[PDB]
Design a binder for these strands. Structure first.
Ligand SMILES: Nc1ncnc2c1ncn2[C@@H]1O[C@H](COP(=O)(O)OP(=O)(O)OP(=O)(O)O)[C@@H](O)[C@H]1O
Ligand SMILES: [Mg+2]
Length: 437
RNA sequence: GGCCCGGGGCGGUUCGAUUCCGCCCUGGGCCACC
């Protein structure tokens, strides 16, 4: 098992077979026909246009070009009108920039409205750079589309592909930019082993320099960081994956990881061994787009974790999971139960003014002096992580994300013990605790 | 929607808060949905 022979076998998993390619071409042809009958101005971009789409993940992108003068509202209505009229079955679900997703002769299709600008200077719609991305790539990626495919397959199998908030990883465009910069998949991996959180890649200048943070400047817009949404941790995972791969090649890196079914009875034993407090906040999932949801689940989860730490429950890690029914914020603390009393720091014996105010407080145990300053024994309002979060989430629901908070406000519960291991969160929990196997 | 930077008003907690927990108003960037 050497890189060379492995990279060779890997092409069999990333490159689309003659039939899938035919299915794509056939679907492409039908799109043209439907669009041409409408006399609409369009252009094919993305993976399909450059033949860099991942085997099994074919999606065609059709961009409807509209004059800059048109209203953002006109793009939406006209664009959605054209999309719907041109797809076999469709769906309209997006967070901000409008588009229509659908199917044509079996292949996934995205019909997207955008302004046809000159120069990607001061973008008007969120997607206006895309057409220029294509113009810049088509004549440079030619000859290395399979190299691109290796990178996509590499990141996909290790959960860091997409750039959407659910993944916070490497976008497809980012992948192609990296291929044009390093020349191949093996070269990208080799060099990625030495990236830092300060690494700056400027493909248009053929330069790598140091900067404020990880930055891949778009050749089409020097101010656009193509990797703006690639999280620090995922950047760290990829770098480490590149070290491991080069240290011990294996097409296991291109195979999606084991589904993992581990029994609930086993998770219970582990928890028992860890002696930790493992609970979750469960509430109804807001009827919103993934891209609006996850950033809210991250915020709610974090705001509760911070409460758990300043509250001295010694939180270990947090996680979250969304089903179609509900959401779950998961937690694990080192403290299952803390005392009722604690000590609050008072003023230095020195100034009687504040000391006087400090001791006038109606107290249960009477303050004392230690190392030159007063201290007082205080009582808590709750002694466990669960009671703490129940209180917090009931009162601070508004700070837990616009939609997520509003849902928690109308209903939420804290699950623990045996009743928790039944919910659809076993995977996340094992992940969260580092259970190996 | 989320994040970052800034105005202006507030409540709570505290011996002590611009600084700790939060709430209203608001300006400017950025990101995800292609
Ligand atoms: N987050 C993004 N950052 C930069 N460019 C993007 C982004 N999302 C989409 N694009 C542009 O739109 C095109 C289509 O994006 P899409 O989400 O369909 O993925 P793709 O690039 O087609 O690759 P793949 O379909 O294999 O994931 C990209 O090639 C790129 O030019
Ligand atoms: Mg596509």
């Amino acid at each position: 098992m050497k890189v060379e022979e492995i990279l060779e076998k890997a092409l069999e998993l990333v490159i689309p077979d003659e039939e899938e390619v035919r299915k794509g071409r056939e679907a492409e042809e039908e799109l043209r026909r439907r669009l041409d009958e409408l006399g609409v101005e369009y252009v094919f971009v993305g993976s399909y246009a450059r033949n860099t789409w991942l085997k099994g993940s074919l999606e065609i992108d059709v961009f409807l070009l509209f004059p800059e003068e048109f209203s953002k509202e006109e793009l939406r209505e006209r664009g959605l009108e054209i999309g719907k009229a041109v797809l076999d079955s469709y769906e309209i679900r997006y967070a901000e920039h409008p588009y229509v997703h659908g199917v044509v002769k079996g292949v996934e299709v995205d019909v997207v409205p955008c302004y046809k600008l000159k120069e990607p200077k001061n973008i008007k719609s969120a997607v206006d750079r895309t057409p220029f991305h294509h113009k810049w790539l088509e004549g440079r990626i030619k000859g290395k589309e399979n190299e691109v495919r290796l990178l996509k397959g590499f990141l996909k199998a290790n959960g860091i592909y997409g750039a959407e908030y659910k993944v916070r990883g490497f976008s497809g465009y980012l992948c192609e930019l990296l291929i044009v910069f390093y020349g191949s998949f093996l070269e990208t991996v080799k060099n990625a082993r030495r990236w830092t959180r300060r690494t700056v890649i400027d493909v248009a200048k053929g330069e790598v320099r140091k900067g404020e943070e990880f930055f891949v400047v778009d050749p089409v817009d020097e101010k656009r960081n193509v990797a703006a949404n690639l999280s620090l941790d995922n950047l760290a995972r990829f770098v480490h994956l590149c070290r491991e791969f080069m240290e011990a090649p294996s097409l296991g890196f291109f195979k999606p990881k084991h589904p993992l079914e581990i029994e609930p009875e086993r998770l219970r034993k582990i928890v028992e061994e860890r002696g930790t407090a493992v609970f979750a906040v469960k509430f109804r999932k807001p009827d919103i787009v993934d891209d609006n949801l996850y950033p809210q689940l991250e915020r709610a989860s974090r705001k509760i974790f911070e409460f758990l730490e300043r509250e001295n429950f010694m939180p270990l890690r947090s996680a979250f999971k969304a089903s179609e029914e509900f959401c779950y914020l998961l937690f694990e603390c080192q403290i299952k139960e803390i005392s009722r009393v604690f000590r609050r720091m008072g003023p230095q014996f020195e100034d009687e003014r504040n000391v006087k105010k400090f001791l006038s407080r109606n107290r249960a145990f009477r303050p004392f002096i230690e190392n030159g300053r007063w201290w007082a024994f205080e009582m808590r309002k709750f002694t466990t992580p669960e009671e703490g979060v129940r209180s917090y989430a009931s009162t601070h629901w508004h700070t837990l994300g616009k939609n997520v908070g509003e849902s928690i406000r109308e209903y939420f519960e804290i699950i623990s013990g045996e009743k928790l291991f039944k919910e659809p969160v076993t995977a996340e929990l094992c992940e969260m605790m580092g259970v190996k196997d």
